[PDB]
Amino acid sequence: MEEEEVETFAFQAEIAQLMSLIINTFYSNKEIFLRELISNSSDALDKIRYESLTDPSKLDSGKELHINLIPNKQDRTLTIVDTGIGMTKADLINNLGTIAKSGTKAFMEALQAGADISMIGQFGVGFYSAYLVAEKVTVITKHNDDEQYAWESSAGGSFTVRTDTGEPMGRGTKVILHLKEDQTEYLEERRIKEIVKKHSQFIGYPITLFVEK
Ligand SMILES: CCNC(=O)c1cc(-c2c(O)cc(O)cc2Oc2ccc([N+](=O)[O-])cc2)on1
């Protein structure tokens, strides 16, 4: 009988409130979730790029800096993979749910006042736009300073962090979106290309799309 070690966490109260607003409100332009996840990947890639200038050894865990987009119709998932700096277990805990960082509170209050979802990434909470289209999100991540971990949440006020012994990452972050039944358009090649073109043209790392036959 194999094993993983897991810990359950409560979302910080304002993040939980924010996620509820995201999950339960109609917004047009839900398509921006992908721009936000790509931009998160870009930010993480910048960190390893500039850190590599003074310490090339940080690239031992993977030299190519790039982004992969992987839709899977049968799994009903859209996966975004990057070879950015990655997150430690403590990074996952501190940055993906237990602390209301940056513009978390400001943006929550803005949505409360009936604001658009569009500027979510400017407030430092772009990751949570995933829940515009996903019922469940899994984040696999590997940083040079720690082991590989899986972060997991279907919202409802909690998330888990566990050891992960699947396919090795090397270094970076994979975000797996389990799509809602009425959001399956984002599994289609044409739609992904449309939204990358409209919102992610200036991203300064190579993006590869894996088109299903
Ligand atoms: C502390 C050093 N690590 C990072 O900054 C980092 C960030 C990411 C990353 C990613 O590569 C892709 C994503 O979709 C998200 C990522 O991290 C986060 C976590 C939370 C937010 N947020 O909006 O609250 C954004 C990016 O990976 N490593």
From Swiss-Prot:
The annotated region (Interaction with NR3C1) lies at 1-213
Binding of ATP, residues = N40, D82, K101, F127
**Outcome of mutating D82A, per the record?**
Impaired ATP-binding. Strong interaction with HIF1A, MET, KEAP1 and RHOBTB2. Loss of interaction with HSF1 and ERBB2. Los of interaction with TSC1
In-chain residues carrying the UniProt-annotated modification N6-acetyllysine:
K47, K73
Could you state what the record's PTM comment says about this protein?
ISGylated.
Similarity-based family: Belongs to the heat shock protein 90 family.
Q: How does it assemble?
A: Homodimer. Identified in NR3C1/GCR steroid receptor-chaperone complexes formed at least by NR3C1, HSP90AA1 and a variety of proteins containing TPR repeats such as FKBP4, FKBP5, PPID, PPP5C or STIP1. Forms a complex containing HSP90AA1, TSC1 and TSC2; TSC1 is required to recruit TCS2 to the complex. The closed form interacts (via the middle domain and TPR repeat-binding motif) with co-chaperone TSC1 (via C-terminus). Interacts with TOM34. Interacts with TERT; the interaction, together with PTGES3, is required for correct assembly and stabilization of the TERT holoenzyme complex.
The name on file for this protein is Heat shock protein HSP 90-alpha
Native species: Homo sapiens
State which gene encodes it.
Answer: HSP90AA1
Segment of the intact protein contained: 12 to 224 of 732
